[PDB]
Amino acid sequence: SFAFGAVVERRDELDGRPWISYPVRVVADTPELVAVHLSHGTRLTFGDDPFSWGPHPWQLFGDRWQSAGILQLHRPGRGHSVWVLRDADTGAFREWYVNVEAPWRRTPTGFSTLDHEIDLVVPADSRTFRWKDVEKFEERARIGHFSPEEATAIRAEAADVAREIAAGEQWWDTRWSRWEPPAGWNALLQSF
Ligand SMILES: Nc1ccn([C@@H]2O[C@H](COP(=O)(O)OP(=O)(O)O)[C@@H](O)[C@H]2O)c(=O)n1
Ligand SMILES: [Mg+2]
Ligand SMILES: [Mg+2]
Ligand SMILES: [Mg+2]
Ligand SMILES: [Mg+2]
Incomplete structure (x- = not known):
């Protein structure tokens, strides 16, 4: 288990390799929570093409994290x-972004996952949320980016969290929206 402020890899692994990989600072690493911090300016490392799912979509923006820094929150298993998202101009908390993805696994350099296209967007202090990229996911399932078993399990995952949020029973502490990084927790440029 990793120390507070340790710099580790967070990777989306596709085709057995890193589709994207970037350095993050550990905020928590416990059996109930893995939280990590992706800072504004951090270098994003993209694997070389071709991938079965095309270039990682974040290459539109280039090879740094352009927005305000984010906290990623993850309940093991x-x-x-859940990403804490802030306004890049004002720094104000805008929303919870639920990124549906594979359960994170620990690697010798940090953690590995994979985005599963379905997303939930939750306004501050709200049980109403917006589904994002559902139809995009279903098309990608149709053409085989995910197998039927995987697609079934992605939809179940996504429906699970959607119900908890709408019930007002978000697994996570909502005080994370006001958490502030220590000073000097700035851009990280290393590549794994
Ligand atoms: N290199 C990057 C890429 C994305 N991002 C952030 O991620 C957001 C979404 O990028 P995206 O390509 O995933 O877009 P959608 O999934 O919202 O369609 C951007 O609007 C930025 O806020 C960034 O800050 N720096
Ligand atoms: Mg996206
Ligand atoms: Mg996503
Ligand atoms: Mg999506
Ligand atoms: Mg989109």
Whole structure:
């Protein structure tokens, strides 16, 4: 288990290799929570083409994290994480972003996952949320980016969190939306 402020890899692994990989700072690493911090300016490392799913979509923006920094929150065993998203101009908390993805696994350099296209967008202090990229996911399932078993399990995952949020029973502490990084927790440029 990793120390507070340790710099580790967070990777989306596709085709047996890193589709994207970037350095993050550990905020928590416990049996109930893995939280990590992706800082504004951090270098994003993309694997070389071709991938079965095309270039990672974040190459549109280039090879740094352009927005405000984010906290990723992840409950071990579960098929998503929750991102704390802030306004890049004002720094104000805008929303919870639920990224549906493979349950994270620990690697010798940090953690590995894979985005599973389905996303939930939750306004501050709200049980109403917006489904994002559902139809995009279903098309990608149709053409075989995910097998039927995987697609079944992604939809179940996503429906699970959607119900908890709408019930007002979000697994995570909502005080994370006001958490502030220590000073000097700035851009990280290393590549794994
Ligand atoms: N290199 C990057 C890529 C994405 N991002 C952030 O991620 C957001 C979404 O990028 P995206 O290609 O995933 O878009 P959608 O999944 O919202 O369609 C951007 O609007 C930025 O806020 C970034 O800050 N720096
Ligand atoms: Mg996206
Ligand atoms: Mg996603
Ligand atoms: Mg998506
Ligand atoms: Mg999109």
